[PDB]
Design a protein around this nucleic acid. Structure first.
Lengths: 129, 129, 129, 129, 129, 129
RNA sequence: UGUCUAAGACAG
RNA sequence: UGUCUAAGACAG
């Protein structure tokens, strides 16, 4: 009914939460930015398009700042040393119903649920073993 | 320990739960598949490589199938009507701390959290607006 | 004395037991087939030939059918939706004594023993990890 | 979780027991070797590749050495007088469910069970008759 | 029986010890990382392969961070100024028994034993004299 | 002082001890050999060079022989059945402090310490798993 | 860098 | 990077 609203990106349970809010809608690409310099902000963008006759495709991008030893509002170079990039590409066949889509979402939440292999590997600077 | 363990990918409160298990590590690609025929299984893969001299890149893939029974040559075979594909790439600088990495994980979780814009949009078969 | 006899290929207690019986032994190839429709039968063949001047080569083959009914034009025939094919070759130097051979057999048995890597990987539609 | 572990290849009660341990797993090929002189070790390798679009192919290999000492020039080296070579290929359609696979495994186990035709023929330096 | 466990890499007798723990097993290459940013971590990797018909070869790599004036979690460039690299290549003929191998290990420990020329030379930024 | 002294390479508690002594420094390569015939001796070599404008590189080599008596031309000669080769290269930045270097040494010692994964694996003729 | 018959050869 | 019949193909 209008989902383009701000939300909590990083939840630290009230104390030090990171909120990200609508900052751009140019070309139908929703963008959320955190309240920072663009170089240190948390950024989220999302868009959908029918990639092919059979599929629709969501493209979600997230940018997360390196915070340890960060100097707020400072000029930190090289940019590549201070930022992590997440590029998510979700492909859904045009036959998927809302239910099918809810399932897909659940699978994504499950993939990243706290305690599961993938997130704990990433959280620990590790691979699988 | 060993983080290469099975985990529940789709949670439907104990019943109807899609759990996925380690199934392969050949060629440095950790694989987990659901307990079905290979033709109908859910599949999750992960791999980390040192992409740049100063970056590490995780490549994660999830395959959500739409199971069906096809009648090929007058014989029924377990198959997939179609598949939904999640393909994500994460680039983290080598300067990232475990705390810096935890931040990335929390952000990804918050991104897909129930009720937030993106999963809402996806589950409703719509864009952000 | 004869070893070209009937034997249990698949052991399901005393019930579902799959038995295979001698069918033919032409051209040095012993063939065993389970009962009922040849089209849905299990097949096992074995032969030993003196490959080189120092080696004897065994060639064991097993076919596991996926029993199904095929309807076409309203006509149904008992068929095999597909078959799983096992093809093994065992080479043993002519210097192997009967003890040496028993050892080779125990090695083959151990390889497939319940709970060991290979059989469990196979049983679970998986690879090694 | 991991199935790439140590296991008993030859079972001589609790004594002469031949154990094989993970040695290497490069290029999708899992290798296991028994201890002591590599020159007299038992070898087991396994790999699964998606052969056709409908089949996955397993390739299991086992080497049984005939332990001996080789004296030459008065210099003795632990060697293998010769080796027995087992090379098996198992093809399984992607339609096989976990049950289908367990059956295939039980079939392989039955084929080599003590007292059945093939294993006894082999064990006795014989063929079928 | 499973040697891929964490261990103490730098022993300072309890007070300030550096522990390194399993972090990756992609392609059979065991990797241990210390609890740091990947750029400041202590890293250890190990693998074996039969380099030739006659020899097996262990390849051990160690990475040690420059600690003096280090800024924990900071971005320190150039990478080459803050890291030491150890590349160990151990070649063992396939005739070596476990005893032969134990000897080889002892020789390595002896080479680096506290008080011996090589380590004291390295520890003092010196050569031999 | 002079760090170019003899030291015990293989320690077997005073008896059976392989001690190695300075034997050459020609061309900047410090050499130590055990007290045997050159054909059967243990050999340790070391050299440091300023590899880069900002690195120093140590190159260390150890040769562990398998002594034997060969009968060449009807005459017995002291020889080596084979040799095991340890070849290691260490690169330390010029910015490394003596304390930074001590760290490197301690890490190498901890690496090869009795009971830790790597020496365990080596001595057992296996990989890490 | 990777291999070896190993301070010297080999292969990129 | 972008697409797909998806750890492997395609297109810059």
């Amino acid at each position: 009914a209008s989902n383009f609203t701000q939300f909590v990106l990083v939840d630290n349970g009230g104390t030090g939460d990171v909120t990200v809010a609508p900052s751009n809608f140019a070309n139908g690409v929703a963008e959320w930015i955190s309240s920072n310099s663009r170089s240190q902000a948390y950024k989220v963008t999302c868009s959908v398009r029918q990639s092919s006759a059979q599929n629709r495709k969501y493209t979600i991008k997230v940018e997360v700042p390196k915070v340890a030893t960060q100097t707020v509002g400072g000029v930190e170079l090289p940019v590549a040393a201070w930022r992590s990039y997440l590029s998510m590409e979700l492909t859904i066949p045009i036959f998927a119903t809302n239910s099918d889509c809810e399932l897909i979402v659940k699978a994504m939440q499950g993939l990243l649920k706290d305690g599961n292999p993938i997130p704990s590997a990433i959280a620990a600077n590790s691979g699988i073993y």
